[PDB]
Every structure is written in structure tokens, then in C-alpha cells.
Amino acid sequence: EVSSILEERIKGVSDEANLNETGRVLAVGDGIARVFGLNNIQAEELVEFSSGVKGMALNLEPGQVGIVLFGSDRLVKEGELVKRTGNIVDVPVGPGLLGRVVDALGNPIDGKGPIDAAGRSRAQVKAPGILPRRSVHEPVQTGLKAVDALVPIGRGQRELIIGDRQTGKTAVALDTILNQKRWNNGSDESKKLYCVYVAVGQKRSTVAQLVQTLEQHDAMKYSIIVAATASEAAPLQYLAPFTAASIGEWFRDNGKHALIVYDDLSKQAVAYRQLSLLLRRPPGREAYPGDVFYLHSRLLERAAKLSEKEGSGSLTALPVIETQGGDVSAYIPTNVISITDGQIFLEAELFYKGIRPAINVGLSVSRVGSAAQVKALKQVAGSLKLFLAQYREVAAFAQFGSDLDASTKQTLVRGERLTQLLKQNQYSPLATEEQVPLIYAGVNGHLDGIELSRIGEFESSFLSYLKSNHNELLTEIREKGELSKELLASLKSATESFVAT
Amino acid sequence: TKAQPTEVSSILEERIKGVSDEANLNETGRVLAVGDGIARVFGLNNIQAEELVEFSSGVKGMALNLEPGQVGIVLFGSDRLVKEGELVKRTGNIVDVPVG
Amino acid sequence: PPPVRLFGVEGTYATALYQAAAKNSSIDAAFQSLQKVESTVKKNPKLGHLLLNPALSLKDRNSVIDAIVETHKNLDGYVVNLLKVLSENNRLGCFEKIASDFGVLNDAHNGLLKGTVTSAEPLDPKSFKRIEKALSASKLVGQGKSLKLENVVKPEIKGGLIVELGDKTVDLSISTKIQKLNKVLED
Amino acid sequence: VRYEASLRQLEQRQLAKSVISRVQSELGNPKFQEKVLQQSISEIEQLLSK
Amino acid sequence: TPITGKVTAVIGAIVDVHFEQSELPAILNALEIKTPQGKLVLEVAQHLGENTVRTIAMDGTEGLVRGEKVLDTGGPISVPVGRETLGRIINVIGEPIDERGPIKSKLRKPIHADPPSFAEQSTSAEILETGIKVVDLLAPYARGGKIGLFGGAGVGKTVFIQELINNIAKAHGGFSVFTGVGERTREGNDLYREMKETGVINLEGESKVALVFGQMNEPPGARARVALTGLTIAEYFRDEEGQDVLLFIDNIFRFTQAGSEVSALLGRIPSAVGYQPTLATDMGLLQERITTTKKGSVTSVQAVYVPADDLTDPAPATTFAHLDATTVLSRGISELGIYPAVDPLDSKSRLLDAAVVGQEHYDVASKVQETLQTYKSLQDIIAILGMDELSEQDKLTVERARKIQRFLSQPFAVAEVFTGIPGKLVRLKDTVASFKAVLEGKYDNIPEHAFYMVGGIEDVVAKAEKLAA
Amino acid sequence: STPITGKVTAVIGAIVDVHFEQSELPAILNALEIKTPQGKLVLEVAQHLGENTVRTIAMDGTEGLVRGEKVLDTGGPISVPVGRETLGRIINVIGEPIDERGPIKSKLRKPIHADPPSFAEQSTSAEILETGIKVVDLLAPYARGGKIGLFGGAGVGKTVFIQELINNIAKAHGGFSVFTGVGERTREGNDLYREMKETGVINLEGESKVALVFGQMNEPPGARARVALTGLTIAEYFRDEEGQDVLLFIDNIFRFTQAGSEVSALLGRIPSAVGYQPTLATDMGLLQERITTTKKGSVTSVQAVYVPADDLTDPAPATTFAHLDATTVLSRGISELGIYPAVDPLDSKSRLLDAAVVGQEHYDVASKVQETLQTYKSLQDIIAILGMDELSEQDKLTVERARKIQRFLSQPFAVAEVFTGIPGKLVRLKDTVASFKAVLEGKYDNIPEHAFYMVGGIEDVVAKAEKLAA
């Protein structure tokens, strides 16, 4: 049946090899083989061991070239011949990766048939130069109002999501992907971000739940899922971000805008550690090899807003680093912090406090600032930063519980309401056009009066009210994207009208 | 195997060729390898510990490690000037400075 | 300069021996005499096996060396200096190792290509000859180095043949083809 | 549909064990000799073409 | 395959063999050295070349004489599986150490088995309620899930698992696997006796449970492959029988730990804290061989001995990554005398969601979390200055939280001996109600001691009356 | 001479070992070029290991290298091009213009390595640079030809602070400047390129009173290390040969430390404390010692430093901390207070701050500021628990002045007419001394705190008070 055609194809692979390089396995163990021979051998080359195991080669020694297996060594055995592929590692890159889960070598692991690939590319590709880069000017809205307001995301920016282990850690990122449904569904290609979610070190069940969640929100019709589950080889895990990067570059190259989530790089470091220490490389600082910074930096620098001569291309990156015990002085967290252009610190205490999404606003920065913040949203959230900063100071004093003066309690009362305003339901991002009103209300102090308990009720109702009456106004906020005097007045009136409900 | 100046093929080659050390490696030494400002010299069997030894790069050094078959001079000068095989005359005076 | 460095540990010793005997001019003589003393070391079974393993002194080692040069008064003087080196480095456990390596350097100097045609069973002499012809015909033979064809029996390599020489092999074994067929027919 | 797809996989693994049976048959025969001659002469043609 | 060898080295329990023939077993093949101690089973782990493999030895290596004859058993060790396993305690080798003689073997399967594919995955969504209030309230379990426990081992950790066995596994019925890596032999004997008593093992009849036990006296190397053996037994149920199973693992720290011991001897450059570099891979492989495929759903319970109770330690840390739910149990909460000692601000499940257990449950949980977090927040202030110097509003919160803390203790029937209080299991529906009331301060008017070491809300009301007398 | 052919023996990492031909010795700190399908890979000879086998560090990617392959020897250190033609182009580490303004028309080339000037050559005059930034001017004035040091957090407007300095001081300065970026992001790079084209300090068709050496983090760690050395040699040419004054800038020098630490590990040296290179002190020393005001010229370096996790006790900032003349700390707290500059006022120390040097009046005014602020901080804890009501009447007035002074430090930056959109301010040194004097005297104790926030001079404090009053 299908079997007869498959057998025909199999019969159809013949033709002798001339094996211009051979070498005999000898020291093999720990999944890290070392072969003697291979006089010709490119660095980073892919070598097919004769046992159907393929392994890239990362150490060239004047004795034994150290070829890291991509398979298990239970299929390898001593004295095998290895035949050099003659191609440095490469992946199929194409449009067909949209709606596909693929493993590192680009085999569909969701088995939705062979990847429709428009090219192949190479794992290492040098980062966009100074000359082919133009300054960021394109917002990216995550639909998390706190994120948009405090640490605005643009295109070509790298912003590090950092914080304690799996505090819905994946979910913080997933929300961004979900809000990109609004533009993505839309036919504006200048607002189309094709989204690539890279999952390294996670178990197959976790990944499967995620892809299912993405299918539930029917967002998988724009997602590419690059996965390297924890079963899969440490070399494949090490190679996994770099082959994700190339997949992204095909979009970037096409000029199409895209966003790549690299969750979690922390497991890449563990992988590189394993790899290096069984390549017998001298142990690095904190046992992570000392060239991890170079590894991570080269990966991260390949997301950029390419110049207008380069068709305004832009791969955007969001790295995700798990901090083990929240240790921000650990070598791997320190290295990443430097590389990136933002910090999106997530704090466990605030999570428990019920501020979900949980963001310690003091440990969160966007060094690429409000050049990528929506112009309207910049106006409304203008003093939101000041208010929150005042709230933090005030809150510290308030702990001592000394009889606070009215000025301190103006701040305190305002601040409490703001915190409740920020909160949002996980797996349910909100439209930015309808986040601008909520911030206007808060900043123009209308909510400061409104009792803390019923802020949540008020928020829901306010949206309903604006949907009812000021839906002309909402349309304008979307359409004109800057609040003019007329819009500011309309909005002011609307909010005032809704003060008493 | 074990680090010996017989690892050094040129030293070894003289030994196979039946050429002897002959007070040029008892006096006087010749650098085997220089890395990290730590020339490791084969020779200098008459060297006193911590003694000042002068290279032919004009560099002066002292010899903190006296090891069997290698004398680990530490350069008082820049690494750049020193190079392998260099004659290293033995100044023969342990570190001394004018006092008065 | 040797005819391509090979072997680090022990092979710096071999290299030295080679280049030193290149300056002696007579490398073949050295090798032949070394071969002869090495052979009589192997054909000395009491302590020529049981004192190939260091456990005795430098001075005692020297006296073993002295017994060795009584065993043959033909050993050149460079390989007698090699005896000195090995005694001084007190490494006798790499004497035959060095001998083998010197053989590799020597026959590289002589220029003889090496090869093996591992198969599942010993091949026909017509096959041997045809392969010898083929290999000489092929550009692999530089006309300056003349193959060794060593049949190896390896039933584990189920059927077919694999020709090996240089860093170039052609593996048309049956085992590999079955392996690939099966593997792709598990896909 | 679910059992139908399963049945195709089941057919393929069943037919796989028949490949193993066939492998034992080939390596038993003096096809074991005759195809070695074929491989031998093929290497003669190939390596001579180098 | 009969491949003679000699024992070149015996460096710890990591013997090295030197085969004299040029046929060389592959990595993860198994060898038997026959001795007057019977066979010793070793497993090839490196090929070091020159026809010298280096093999992990899964049995004790005392008395070995160098050069001793080895024979290669070939391939991974094949345990015997079936339903005939049920009603056996089996050693790492597969020996019937419960001495019910030879196990009737059907299929004997290799210890190493590749983890099922991404395609084979099937995601759970089941609610599995344990009737343990703290579990139910804070982090509901699910059938097929991977459940996790952290803290001091058998300091109450073992007891917790025993409570889980007592509740879940009779209700579940069907096949269940207990695999105990490096457990205290006496505790294992207690379990064996107890299981036989509760008929789950009925040796006269049939047993719907099977047991694998690896004592902590067993050599480190033996302990490393106790786990892999158990997983094979589970796979036979998961796959071949295709009936939902259960699995218990205690401790999976012992799995990691065992690896770290052998790692050093094997010759690996030690990674941080001293853990094996292959820590990530080994844990990964193991934890993906425990999963719910479309073939079957295996609820697993994993017990992590956290060393020095430092979660920041890399071995516990990487364990936290592979679990689906965790309920970290803290020594501090143990000192507070709350048994179960689950830390309530350090528990998570992906099953705690306002969809999965509905908005009402989620709302109830939200308030508990907020209240307790406040209470934790004010711990500094409480110590430095009295509670009377806290705000009045806060004092209500503090009083409520103190009550919640006391309320959370649920006497356990397995711990009935230790507590001296008859255990009580409270319904999931009941739990939500009970906490809801307390959160609304309905029954907040009666002492903290009333809430202390007693079950459900109704029981508290009654216990107030008991105290009132 | 006759190009020493080398065959690679080991591609390990950045470390690539070459086996140069016997009987023809290469030399320490030479430069090897390996012809590659993309450019010439440059390997810097860093050890000799014997048998004419050197161990060299790569300055370009090592991917695809084939073990053994001809390696030409170009000898001596990597020789960059220097000239007045070097002004007006971005030049990568291996000395090639990466802005593609065509090949620089070299006059001279010079080696990357050079010897620090001798004690005799070094003679340094104390002169006072004017920053214009009020906090800097009063509380830690900068000094001409100095070795100014911007110790601070990660990109906490670190780039911005430097940018303000370039905007004010560089444009003002008659000397040349060299902007050298060690391991910095290409977003930051592209912004700098665009911005310095915009500020016209680079006029592509016009003249350029600055040169650029952009070394970015997407370069191998080895290449990252020798970005500093390259930039310095351009400065040496300016200082010496062109005989002009300079105003060097390097960014961020923790990247220089970090880079060296990594290739130290690769060089096989046993890691030193907190994993830093055991040669850290001397390497830092070579960079700093090379930068000096000789008789020949004067170079005013401003070097950014990133203090990992704001722990200055970490050895890498601490080693640098000694070596730089005029320290400035930019602290997280002050940034968080919403005070931009983020300069920590009680943690800013400058060599020239001595009473005679800055003049007695300047000294006295600044001394009063220091005491007032330090008092405010000591009392801050007391205010925290006890409240402000339990403090002395004198103390309460001091606290009120301190809050006013705290926001009097605030000045909006010219380069934050993008960041905050508030017009920048350059306040004359004398004017700042006078204006601060008034405040201290309390001749503006009738002014509210927010009327000191982001003002300029005295005129501005009054004007913003009048504005706020309405």
C-alpha cells in the first residue's frame, strides 16, 4: 500500500560512496565519541557514524577529533567508521514551518508530513551589522497592560524574562504570543509578526500541553514550534537555539516581522556545560564553560530591526532565564542580563500576593524605552511611572505604620488602586485599544476614589460601558493611536460620567 | 607521557645523535618553551635558587621553580621580547640591589 | 622533518629516532638492526617478557641494557643511544611500541602504501589480484607507495567487502546495506 | 479512522518482521557468495573509475 | 555473547574488563562474572578502546581477583514482566527476593527502553482527589500526573506517600507499581507486611500490586539501575496491558545521587556541587520514560530527598523542572507541628486553574494564598514588635491566618499511630465549602486550638464544643 | 620573511594551535593571517609550546576550519592603521573599515601592543575639566587629561551618560575624540552611528572630529579582548604624532575584563578569584598605564564600567576602582528616586576636589553639601521609624534643605530630549557654585521641593517656583 511506495523509495537509494575520510571510533562513551582519523574535517561539521548516528564535531585535536553524537551510544560501538557529511549543520527553513512542531533536525515531531521548505540555512550566521540596522520604531503589544505600559516591546529588541522557576514562567511569554492573534488574524503584513516559540529542555508532556493550548486559542495557525525535549541529546539541545535562530532569519530576511521566544536559555547553559565537560574543555566559572557568554551573545544578537534598505526586516527576541533561588549574581544570569536590552523581573512574593502577572517594577527596565510604546499609551501612562515609584516609597514607610500624613495617604490610596488595576487574568490578554481607557481613568485619578474591592468590578463594567457608549471613542483610539484634544476631552467626559457608574 | 626535556624532540634528537649537554646546560641554559612569562629552560644546572638569570633578549628573571630538567624562570620583562631556544646566561648573583 | 608526524606520546621518540637516523643517513640499517634486536627481545621469553615491566632500578635497568648490547653487536650506535634514552626515561613498556612506530616512519620513508580489504570471509586470490590491480590503477597509488592488501575476516561485517587504504574507504559491505535498508524501512 | 491509521502502522511493523525473515534467507543462500562477487566486481568498476 | 575477558581493574564497583577477542560488546550490554557469590551483573558504560571496556557493576565487587574470567551476557539486562510480577518483590537483577521462587516469565524486556515519542503523548485533565485537605485546596492531583514531594526523607516524607497509597490505590484499583530506590530495609518490610494486610498484595490470591525494592544497603551502582528496572515493569502495564497503573518512586534523589557517586569513579570532570555532568540527561531520560501516552496513563508519585533542605541544590532544582505538580513540604512547617507539613506558599499544580477546578474553587484558593502571604509578610514585624502594634485591619488578617494555619492540619489514618488521632478524609466538595466559610470568618470566633489538629469545618464546630467543656 | 607556513593542529575554541614550519621561529604577540573563504582570520600568537607549535588566540570566527591548512605569518602585533584619515570611519578590531567608506588611506600603521610611557615621560598637570552637569561639577569636578571613570550599573542610562558627555564636552573640545565600544550591542551601536551623524560630529561628506572603533559582543571573546588595544593605538597616534589633545572614551570596560577572563580560561591558566584571569591586574594596568598625559599630548579618557550586580566589592570593579583617577558612581537608588543624573552624591570622589585646586569657595560650598546630605541619610532611618517629628528643629530644617538639594541635583540631559523630551541644560561652573551657595544659605527656603526638580541655574529654580505657584 503505502508500504509498497516506501519500499520503492528505499530501493531507490543506492550508489556507492567514495568515503574520502574515515576514522575509527575508539574512545566512545558518555555519548561523546572521539574518532581517530578524519584528516579533512571542517569545524562544526556533521559526521554520519556508521550505525545511523549523526554527530556534529566540535573539537579537532591532532590525535582524535571529538565528534559529539546527536544519538545515544547504545547504537554506537568501538571501531566504527565515520563518514563526514561534508556539510556543516543546516536546517530546512521555509514558510511551511508555520503550524508545525519540528525537532532540531527539522523532522516534524507532530508528523504533519514533511516540512515545506523554501531553503536550508546554517546554524551559525553572523549578526546584522551596524550598517544594516535601522532604529526601532514599531510597537509590539503583548496585551498585558502592565508590560505594555512599563516595559514596552518593540521589534528587534531583546528583553529578558527573568524570575523564579516555572511561576507560570512559560505562561508569561505565552500571553504575548496570544495577543499577537489580533494583528496576525488581521491582514496587515506590516503588523504581521510570525511567532516562533522555542522550547528547550522541557518534557514532551509540557510541550504537548502548550501546543494544545495554542491550538485551543487557534493561534497555532501562525506559530512555529521548535522543540528540543529533555530526552533529546545534549548536543541537540545546544544546537537547538541556533537552529531556531536560522528559522527566524528566513522570516527576517523576507522582511516579514517576527518574534522568537527562547524559553529557557538556562537549560541551554546546562547543556553546554555537559557538552563542554565531556569535551574535556577546562571547567569554566561556576562550572559553566567560559565562552558561554560568547555562545549566548552570538545567539541573542541575531534579532534586530534591519535597515530600510534591508526592507525594514525585524526578528524580535524574548529570552527567558530561570533564576535558581532568584540568584541574580549567578554567572549565567549575570551574563544574560548584560546581553539583553531589558529586564522583565518576575517576583514570586508578588505572585503569591496575587499580583499576577507578577512584575517587580523596580527590577524591571526597558533600556530601549518608550520609543516603541504606543503614542497614545505614552500620553496616558505618563505619570503612571511616577505614581508607582511614589507608591513604592510610600509603601516602605507604611510598613513601620507610623501615623501617615495625608499626602502619603493620597499616594497610598492611589497606589493600592493602581496595583489592582494592573492585575489581569492569565491566558486572557486584553486589547490595547481598550487598555488605553483603563489607564486614563487610573491616571486621571477617577479610580483613586473608587473602593479597592470593587475595582475589579469597575474595570469590567467600564469596558462594557465604553463598549456601549464610547465605542465611537474606542474606534478612534485604535484608528488615530494618539489621543488628540478632542479624544482627551471625550475620554475625560466618559470617565467622569462613569465615576458613579 | 611525563614532562621531560626528552619530550622535546630537539633535545632528544641531540641525545639520539650522541651529542652531550657539555656545560652549556650545566652553566648556561637554553629556553625550551616560553609561555605566560614563565620560560622553562633546559640547562642551568649550576643555578642557585631564586638566582638572577639573564636572557639574550636582555630580559632578567629569577628562577622560582627549580624542577628536575626544567628551570622555571619568571621574566622581570615583557613576554614579547623572549622567544624559545634562547641562550640564557646565568648572571650568577641572587637578587641584590644597591644599598647605602 | 619526518615523513609526516604521527604519534605524539612515544612517537616523539620515534620521530627523533627517524630524523636522527636521517642525519645518520642510514635509516634502513638502523631499522633492520632494531628489528633484529626487537625480535630477539621478543624471542627472549624469560625476562625478555617478564622484565619488559619496570619494577627494578635505573642501575639495574642499565645493566639490562648492557646485556642487550651483548646480544647483538650490530645495533648501530644511534639505536644504542636509543637504548640509553629508554633506560634513562626508564620506559621499557614502549620499546616495541617505538619499534612499531619506527616501522611506520621507516616504511613511509621507503614509501609503501598500507591497506586492508576487510571482508566477511577470505576472498579469492583472483579477487585479491583484481583489487591489487585496481588500487594501483586508482589515483590513490601515487606510484611511489605500493599497497599492502591485508584480508581481515569479520563475519560481524556480514557479507560484502570494505576496501580501506589511505583515509579513503569504500564500504560495500552487506551489513551496512542491510542496516540502511532496515533503518529506512523502519521509517 | 483511528483504528484504520493504527492498522496501517500495524501492517507496516508486521511486514517489518517479514523483512527480518527475508534477511535471514538471503544471508543463508549462496547469494551470500554470489552477491559478494557482484559487490567485488562493482568495486572494481567504481574504484577504476576513480 | 560468550566473550571471555579478564578483569583489568577493579576501581570501586566500576570494574574494567579487557576482552581478548576482537568481538566487543556494545555500550549498555551486560556481563556476568561468575564467582562463588554467583553471577555479578555488570553493564558496559564506556569503551576505552584496545578491547578494554569499562563497566558499571550492579552487584558488590568485594573479593574480585584481577584477571578473573568474564563472560558477556550481551545486551541490556532483561527483567521479566507480565502480570506474574504482581505479587513479587524483585531485585535489580530481577531475582525474586520475596522468595516465591521463579517468576513465571512471559516477555523479558531490556532495562533500557527509549522514551515514547512526542506524537505518543496524551495530555491529562483528570481530577484526582486524595481527600487530603491541603492537597485538595492548594494543588489538586490528576490521573496520569507526576506528583512531587520535597524535604527530609522518611521524616514524614515516607509517611505522606503511605497515606497516598492508602487513599488513592484502593479506589484506583488495577495494576500499581511500587518502586523504592534506596529505602530503609525495615520500612520496606513494614510496607510489605502492611500491603499484605490490606490485601492489595494477597499472596494466597492475586495481587494487583507489584513491588520492586532497592535497599539503601545495596551498592551505589545497584541503586542506579533499580529505577530503570521498575520503569520497565511499569511500561509493560502501560503499553502491553494498556490498563492504567500507579507508580511510586522514593526517592528519586537516590537516583541522581547514585549517579553522582559512580560518575567520579567513571572519570568525569565533576560538575557543580559535585553532581555528574550527565545529570540533566539521565534525569531527563528517566522522567520521560514516566509519562501518559495514548497507550496508557500512569499516575506517578516521586519523592525528593532535598539534601540539607536546600532547594537551590542542582539535583533538586532539576527535579523541580520535570514534575507536573509539586507539594514541597518544609521542615519549618514541620516545626510548627502541622502534619501534613506541606508548605502552602510552595506548592503548585498546573491543575490549579479557574477552568480546571472552576472559578469558585480558584477564588477560594486565591484568598487563602493572599491571606497566608500577608501573614508571612508580617512575620518580621510580628517578631520585632508585638501584634498589637500592627494595624487593626491587619490584626483581623493575622488572626484569620493563624486560624487558617491551624485549620490546614488534617490527621492521617496512616499516621494514626504517630498522631494518636484517628484520621479523617474530607471530600473535595466539602473542602471548598469548609475553607469558604472560614475565609468569610463565619466560624472565626472560636480558639486556634479548636482548629488545631482536626479535620473538616463540622469537626471544628464540634471540637469547639469539646474545648468549651 | 619567507611566509612561515603553519598547519592548524587543534581547533579547540578561540585557541587554535598552529604548527609552524621547523627551523623558522615565530614570536610572542605576532599576528598570523590564515586565508579563509571569508577574509583573513587573524590569530595572535600567545604562547610558544615548542616543536614550532604555537598556541594562538583567534580574533575572528573559527567555524569551518580544517585541521591543517596554510597559515601565513605577517609577524609582530596586529597593526592597525593610524592617521587623520582614520577619523570619520568605523573600524573593526582587525583594522578594516566596517562602515564601508572604502579602504582607509593609511599613512602609518602601528602595533596594537605598545609600551606604557616611562615615569620620566609621564608628567601630568592638574587642570579642571568642566562638565556642565551640575552634580558632576559641584560634587566631583572632572579634570582635564584625567582618567575619568563612570562606575555604574548595567546600561542604567550608562550609554546615555556617556552620550551626554559627548554631546557637551566633545562638541566643545578642540581635541579629537575616539569612541571605542568594547562588546556592546548593535542596537546601541546603530544609535550611536546615527546620532553622531546627527550631531554632526561625524559629517560623512564633511569632516569628522571623531573616529569610531565599534567592537560588538557578537565577536569571539578573543576578538573582544583586543578591541581596547586597537582603540588605544589610535589615541596614541593622536596624542603623539598629531600632537593634539584627545578625549578618549571606552565603553564598557567590564566587557574588557570579562573578555580577558574567558580567554584566560581557554589559555589554560588556573582560574583566579571569582573566575577572573590571574593576569587581571597587569592587563588592566597595561591599558590604564598606556593612557596618560605625556609631554607629547594629553588624553582625557572617560571609561564606562559595569559593576556586576552593583557590588563594587566584586574584584573586577574593585581592581578598576584604583586605577581610575576621577571616580563617579551612578547608583540604582538615585535612578529609582527619579533623579537623572543617577550619580550617587556621597559616593563620588575625584582626585581634584582638593580645596586649593578647585578654589576655597568651591570647596567650602561642596563641603557643606556633603555634610548636609550625609546628615539627611543618617537621619533617614530615624525618620523611617520615629518619624520626622522627633527630630531637632535644626535637623528638621536640614532635612528640608536636603530634600530640596536632592532634587536640585536633577538636571535634564540634552540627549534626553528624546528620553524625557525636556530641554537640556549646560550650567556654568561658577554659576553652579553660586546657585548651590544660595540654597545652602537657605535663601530659597521659601521654594517648594518640586521647583528644584529638573531645573538649571538659580534663575531656573526661581522660574520653576513661579510657574508651580500658578
Beta-strand pair E38-47/E52-57: antiparallel
CB pair distance less than 8 Å for A203 and E284: yes
Cα distance between residue E229 and residue E179, in whole Å:
9
Query: Domain B21-93, CATH 2.40.30.20 — does that match?
Result: yes
E387 grid coordinates: 501584634
A35, A64 in Cβ contact below 8 A?
yes
E127 grid coordinates: 481530577
Say how many C-beta atoms besides its own lie within 10 A of residue C32's C-beta: 14
Beta bridge partners of E197: none
Residue A357 CB partners (closer than 8 Å, separation 6+): A144, A146, A147, A172, A175, A346, A423, A424, A426
Which burial class, exposed, middle or buried, applies to B72 when counting CB atoms under 10 A from its CB (0-12, 13-18, 19+)? middle
Judged by a CB distance cut-off of 8 A, whether residue C117 touches chain D is no
Residue A304 CB partners (closer than 8 Å, separation 6+): A127, A128, A133, A156, A314, A315, F186, F187
Cα end-to-end span (Å), chain A: 69
Which burial class, exposed, middle or buried, applies to A235 when counting CB atoms under 10 A from its CB (0-12, 13-18, 19+)? buried
CATH code: domain of residue A445: 1.20.150.20
CB pair distance less than 8 Å for C88 and B6: yes
Residue E244 CB partners (closer than 8 Å, separation 6+): E143, E144, E172, E174, E175, E296, E297, E298, E299
Cα distance between residue F61 and residue F63, in whole Å:
6
E408, E338 in Cβ contact below 8 A?
yes
Cα distance between residue F179 and residue A217, in whole Å:
49
Judged by a CB distance cut-off of 8 A, whether residue C137 touches chain D is yes
C122 grid coordinates: 577470505
E351, E140 in Cβ contact below 8 A?
yes
- Domain with C67, as residue range(s), is 11-110
Residues counted in chain C: 187
Q: Which of E48, B32, F26, F17 is nearest to A62 (CA)?
A: F17
State the alpha helices, DSSP H only, in E41-80.
none
User: Domain segments of chain F: what residues?
Assistant: 2-77, 78-352, 353-470
User: Which of A52, A87, A122 delimits the end of a domain?
Assistant: A87
Could you give the C-alpha distances from A313 to A155, A256, A306, A339, E427, in angstroms and in order? Answer: 9, 6, 5, 21, 57
F208 grid coordinates: 569628522
- Domain with A386, as residue range(s), is 374-501
Q: Is the alpha carbon torsion for E419, E420, E426, E431 positive or negative? A: negative
Beta bridge partners of E44: E55
Under DSSP, is residue E104 helix (H, G, I), strand (E, B) or coil?
A: coil
Q: What is the DSSP string of F95-141?
A: S-BSS-S-S---SEEEES--PPPPTTTB----EE-----HHHHHHS-
Could you give the C-alpha distances from F410 to E407, F335, F436, in angstroms and in order? Answer: 54, 11, 13
Q: What is the largest CA-CA distance in chain B?
A: 53
Return the ∠ at Cα A419 (arms to A416 and A424), rounded to 5°.
Answer: 145
Q: Which of F298, F3, F277, F243 is nearest to F122 (CA)?
A: F298
Counting other chains too, the contacts that E431-438 makes at CB distance below 8 Å and 24 or more residues apart are E431/E133, E431/E136, E431/E137, E431/E456, E432/E136, E432/E137, E432/E360, E432/E361, E432/E364, E433/E457, E434/E133, E434/E458, E435/E137, E435/E364, E435/E368, E435/E404, E435/E407, E436/E364, E438/E400, E438/E403, E438/E404, E438/E407
* Bond into E76 cis (ω within 30): no
Cα distance between residue A429 and residue A177, in whole Å:
10
Give the residue from chain A lying closest to F310, CA to CA: A329
Cα distance between residue F434 and residue F457, in whole Å:
9
Q: Which of A65, A69, A72 is nearest to A56 (CA)?
A: A69
Give the residue from chain F lying closest to A88, CA to CA: F64
| A203 plus A324 within the same structural domain | yes
- The CATH class given to the F78-352 domain equals alpha beta
Give the residue from chain A lying closest to F212, CA to CA: A130
Task: Write the Ramachandran bin of A105: left for phi over 0, alpha for psi from -120 to 50, otherwise beta.
Answer: alpha
Catalytic status, residue E68: no
Minimal C-alpha gap between C160 and chain D (Å): 5
Contacts of A101 in chain E (CB under 8 A): 118
Contacts of B84 in chain F (CB under 8 A): 25, 48, 50
Q: What is the DSSP string of F384-442?
A: HHT-STTS-HHHHHHHHHHHHHHTTS----GGGTTTT--------HHHHHHHHHHHHHT
Cα distance between residue A500 and residue C113, in whole Å:
98
Phi, psi for residue F43 in degrees, rounded to 5: -120, 125
DSSP class of E267: T
B12 grid coordinates: 632528544
F264 grid coordinates: 584566560
Does a structural domain hold residue A5?
A: no
CATH code: domain of residue A369: 3.40.50.300
Give the residue from chain E lying closest to A270, CA to CA: E280
Cα distance between residue A65 and residue A35, in whole Å:
6
F354, F329 in Cβ contact below 8 A?
no
Chains D and B touch (3+ CB pairs under 8 A): no
| A189 plus A260 within the same structural domain | yes
Cα distance between residue A293 and residue A331, in whole Å:
9
A35, A41 in Cβ contact below 8 A?
no
Domain covering E352-469: architecture: Orthogonal Bundle (1.10)
DSSP class of A116: -
- The CATH class given to the E77-351 domain equals alpha beta
Catalytic status, residue F185: yes
Cα distance between residue A448 and residue A465, in whole Å:
19
Cα distance between residue E160 and residue A460, in whole Å:
43
Residue A203 annotated as lining a ligand binding site: no
Could you give the C-alpha distances from E213 to B100, E43, E227, in angstroms and in order? Answer: 83, 20, 9
| A382 plus A350 within the same structural domain | no
Q: Which helix (H) or strand (E) holds A343?
A: strand A342-345
DSSP class of A40: S
E275 grid coordinates: 553532581
CB pair distance less than 8 Å for A21 and C176: no
Say how many C-beta atoms besides its own lie within 10 A of residue E303's C-beta: 25
Beta-strand pair C160-165/E14-19: unpaired
SS3 content of chain C, % helix, strand, coil (to 5): 50, 10, 40
Beta-strand pair E342-349/F6-11: unpaired
A163, A348 in Cβ contact below 8 A?
yes
Query: Domain E1-76, CATH 2.40.10.170 — does that match?
Result: yes
Say how many C-beta atoms besides its own lie within 10 A of residue E221's C-beta: 28
Minimal C-alpha gap between C23 and chain B (Å): 8
Q: Which of B14, F421, E272 is nearest to A324 (CA)?
A: E272
Resolution in A: 4.4
Residues 15-54 of E with CB under 8 A from A: 24, 26-28, 45-49, 54
Cβ pairs bridging A and D (under 8 Å):
11
Q: Which of F82, F80, F105, F83 is nearest to F92 (CA)?
A: F80
Return the ∠ at Cα E286 (arms to E285 and E291), rounded to 5°.
Answer: 100
Binding-site residues of E for ATP, in ranges, read: 151-158
Q: Which of E248, E249, E263, E257 is nearest to E306 (CA)?
A: E257
Helix axes A292-300, F253-267, angle to 10 degrees: 130
User: Which of A87, A114, A130 delimits the end of a domain?
Assistant: A87
The technique is cryo-EM
Residue F156 CB partners (closer than 8 Å, separation 6+): A365, F330, F332, F335, F342
Q: Which of A75, A73, A81, A77 is nearest to A47 (CA)?
A: A81
The one-letter code for the residue type at E38 is G
Contacts of A9 in chain D (CB under 8 A): none
Domain covering F2-77: architecture: Beta Barrel (2.40)
Say how many C-beta atoms besides its own lie within 10 A of residue A258's C-beta: 25
State the catalytic residue, choosing from A204, A280, A285, A367. Answer: A367
Query: What order of strands is seen across the sheet that includes strand C168-173?
Result: C151-153, C115-119, C160-165, C168-173
Rg (CA), chain F: 25
Q: Which of E344, E348, E324, E353 is nearest to E147 (CA)?
A: E324
C61 grid coordinates: 635497568
Catalytic status, residue E184: yes
DSSP class of F248: E
* Bond into E251 cis (ω within 30): yes
State the catalytic residue, choosing from F7, F40, F84, F185. Answer: F185
Judged by a CB distance cut-off of 8 A, whether residue D13 touches chain A is no
Quickly tell me which residue has 522550547 as its cell.
Answer: A199
Beta bridge partners of F34: F41
Residue F175 annotated as lining a ligand binding site: no
E131 grid coordinates: 481527600
Cα distance between residue C129 and residue A167, in whole Å:
72
Phi, psi for residue C23 in degrees, rounded to 5: -85, -15
E253, E319 in Cβ contact below 8 A?
yes
CA dihedral B18, B22, B24, B25 (to 10 degrees): 70
Phi, psi for residue E293 in degrees, rounded to 5: -95, 180
Beta-strand pair F301-306/F248-251: parallel
State the catalytic residue, choosing from E32, E183, E235, E261. Answer: E183
Q: Which of F139, F87, F188, F185 is nearest to F334 (CA)?
A: F139
E304, E149 in Cβ contact below 8 A?
yes
Does a structural domain hold residue A160?
A: yes
CATH code: domain of residue C92: 1.10.520.20
Q: What is the DSSP string of A355-404?
A: -SS---TTS-EETTGGGSS-HHHHHHTTTHHHHHHHHHHHHHHHHHT---
Beta bridge partners of F91: F97
- The listed CATH number (1.10.1140.10, 1.10.1370.30, 2.20.28.120, 3.30.70.260) that belongs to domain F353-470: 1.10.1140.10
Most F-contacting residue of A38, A60, A158, A286 (CB-CB within 10 A), to test interface:
A60
Cα distance between residue E199 and residue E201, in whole Å:
5
Under DSSP, is residue A346 helix (H, G, I), strand (E, B) or coil?
A: coil
Q: Is the alpha carbon torsion for A478, A482, A487, A492 positive or negative? A: positive
Cα distance between residue F442 and residue E239, in whole Å:
85
Q: How far is CA C49 from the centre of its chain?
A: 20
User: Which of A373, A399, A427 delimits the end of a domain?
Assistant: A373
Cα distance between residue F49 and residue F51, in whole Å:
7
Q: How far is CA A117 from the centre of its chain?
A: 23
Q: Which helix (H) or strand (E) holds B89?
A: strand B87-94
Residues 275-314 of A with CB under 8 A from F: 281-282, 284-286, 289-291, 293-294, 297-298, 301-302, 304-305
Residue F145 annotated as lining a ligand binding site: no
A151, A160 in Cβ contact below 8 A?
no
Beta bridge partners of A29: A32, E46
